[PDB]
Design a protein around this ligand. Structure first.
Ligand SMILES: CC(=O)Nc1ccc(CN2CCC3(CC2)C(NC2CCCCC2)=NC(=O)N3c2cccc(F)c2)cc1
Ligand SMILES: CC(=O)Nc1ccc(CN2CCC3(CC2)C(NC2CCCCC2)=NC(=O)N3c2cccc(F)c2)cc1
Lengths: 368, 368
């Protein structure tokens, strides 16, 4: 139980992201920061905004150093602009260290902050290759490992409906049951992995495995959904529809355009299939599988329980977002270039999320 | 309001001391630490003890370094023994820094820990001259200032009945009203000061001022009482008795051997005198005075309110303990070798604690 003080250091509202407290500058300014394994910049709201309860005040921090360079980070859905600098940073419920880190002070944004989320910045935990303005801006975790003796590893327990744990520098055995199964990090930019097989209720989707990782597959704590490449999305929806045919749903439900609601406590979880993603293992021809329940891929949105189908389509590869992570204790073992999955200590009485192996899967190298 | 996150970072039970959270080692181990300006060792309970809710577990800290030397710290009333080492230390509700500090792991003690106090160690904030085993063991605050940019200053707001604030690296203007008055630190060992005059209800005690500082006068957050040298104690008690003669008290009350209790809300504060200590100022022949109310020097010990007279005798000089500090915001300005007093933002409807000046006092140098 040595990592006990980091347990339950994450909070969130359902579907709006998990955040950790980080303390920046001198004297201390503590903010709520989105934990985001799908980006690589540490950035904080630094000016008033309708959706922010507070923001970073650089003028009040004696240890703040303006890098006198701007930074812009755009996505499909939203973007922010700000000014680069460095400052002292700690994580009060994380490792017992203080580092000098790059920090982007967000002065303007479009569709970035979420009304009511309670977070005021983002902690990009992915690698420098995808940092903005470029890969010379050292990400936070790189600084942490370079400046301290903290082991080059973190792990995430995301508990759905929110709370969870980010263990920095180690693995907490109370956060999981059974064994940890590891898949290689294919390339250090995003947390890129290789999906070798997909099943819906034990039935192989039977697509060429290249399609599952078409253009990449990433593990992303900052994305809510399981996102699938279009061809894979279509086949997966066809199969899920067929397996859940004891009730019919509007087409728009599968497209996230319509919600379905059930009276409190009556959601027929039993009618929906389990989904298995097989991941490349650490030994030649060996794989393992992670299995998710409808409780993960149907996300709650007061007499009625409304759900949105949280599998969606992508044109930029597969994104294993929070719907996948919530079933699991996930280990970002950067030191050994691998990601681990185990059943989370945070299902129903008939079925459980699972991590199972080993399986024999040949030509897995062909899937990338 | 830049020091806001350090406000209210102290807790305590009445008469049992004020403590701050400190986080030691890797992974983090957070303990409650007595804030003690009357000693100079950082030391923590490191083995089970009936009176400890928790203790430091060196074996669980990867960053702990055994100095392989023992340490023993004795007082009149109590003592502890332990092992010297170093480890990473932060103060989660103090400065945003992490330092490597000397830490004594307390393995045995006699009459040191207090049953029910909620603290598990001590933070000796005084100077190296009085560190054990000797002055080569750098105290915590010295390490803090040497390793970081934190200004060489702290201040204490002790709020009586408990809570309070320790502001590290600065002064928080919301914690006091009126002006700060400074007295020199005569010598850097204890926080030694010079008392130049004492009044009971505005009446000069008329003792030679050398007696007030006979052998030293110190400011000590770890001592509950105002402690006075015997000759001064006797004169002060005679005067307080005379000024409070509208009611009579047993002799043992003035000696702390007897308590007196009053039905809730009926304590006749009005019958007891105010006490003024005049302190050497920063300019030639200039002094100022701090004035304390019976609410400070009568300390509460359920239909009745019991009090102990918290002025007591000493054979080792005057000790301005928590009964003095509680009236005031106290600034330990180590950088400018001076201690500041202002009226605390934490009295009755007729009288208030006060810090007043300037007064003309000649030959103050003769008082040491
Ligand atoms: C209002 C709101 O919901 N705020 C929000 C939510 C969440 C987040 C973390 N991330 C940032 C980035 C994110 C996924 C989530 C992305 N991801 C990747 C590109 C490369 C390939 C594989 C996905 N595409 C996007 O359009 N994103 C995106 C999504 C929503 C808003 C946004 F501003 C960007 C930030 C901001
Ligand atoms: C059980 C308990 O009450 N625990 C306690 C209380 C408080 C504390 C902080 N300090 C430590 C030291 C203290 C004053 C308070 C001291 N002070 C000075 C010497 C030099 C000259 C001017 C006073 N004399 C003593 O006998 N002390 C002393 C007092 C009580 C217990 C004890 F173990 C030592 C520690 C431990």
């Amino acid at each position: 139980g040595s990592f006990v003080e980091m347990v339950d250091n994450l909070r969130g509202k359902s579907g709006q992201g998990y955040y950790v407290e980080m303390t920046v500058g001198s004297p201390p300014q503590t903010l709520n920061i989105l934990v985001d394994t799908g980006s690589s910049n540490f950035a904080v709201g630094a000016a008033p905004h309708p959706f922010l309860h507070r923001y970073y005040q650089r003028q009040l921090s004696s240890t703040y150093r303006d890098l006198r360079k701007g930074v812009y980070v755009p996505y499909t859905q939203g973007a922010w602009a700000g000014e680069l600098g460095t400052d002292l940073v700690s994580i009060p419920h994380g490792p017992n260290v203080t580092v000098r880190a790059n920090i982007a002070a967000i002065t303007e944004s479009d569709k970035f902050f979420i009304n009511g989320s309670n977070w005021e910045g983002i902690l990009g935990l992915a690698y420098a290759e995808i940092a903005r303005p470029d890969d010379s801006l050292e990400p936070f975790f790189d600084s942490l490992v370079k400046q301290t003796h903290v082991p080059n590893l973190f792990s995430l327990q995301l508990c759905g409906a929110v709370g969870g744990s980010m263990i920095i520098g180690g693995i907490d055995h109370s956060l999981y049951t059974g064994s940890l199964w590891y898949t290689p990090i294919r390339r250090e930019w995003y947390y890129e992995v290789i999906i070798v097989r997909v099943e819906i209720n034990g039935q192989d989707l039977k697509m060429d495995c290249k399609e599952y990782n078409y253009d990449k597959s990433i593990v992303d704590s900052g994305t809510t959904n399981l996102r699938l490449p279009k061809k894979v999305f279509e086949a997966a929806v066809k199969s899920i529809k067929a397996a859940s045919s004891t009730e019919k749903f509007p087409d728009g439900f599968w497209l996230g355009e319509q919600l379905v609601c059930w009276q409190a406590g009556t959601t027929p979880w039993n009618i929906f299939p389990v989904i298995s993603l097989y991941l490349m293992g650490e030994v030649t021809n060996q794989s393992f599988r992670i299995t998710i329940l409808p409780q993960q891929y149907l996300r709650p949105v007061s007499q009625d329980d409304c759900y949105k189908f949280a599998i969606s389509q992508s044109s930029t590869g597969t994104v294993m977002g929070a719907v996948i992570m919530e079933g699991f204790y996930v280990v970002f073992d950067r030191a050994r270039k691998r990601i681990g999955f185990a059943v989370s200590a945070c299902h129903d009485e008939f079925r459980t999320a699972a991590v199972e192996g080993p399986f024999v899967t040949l030509d897995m190298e062909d899937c990338g």
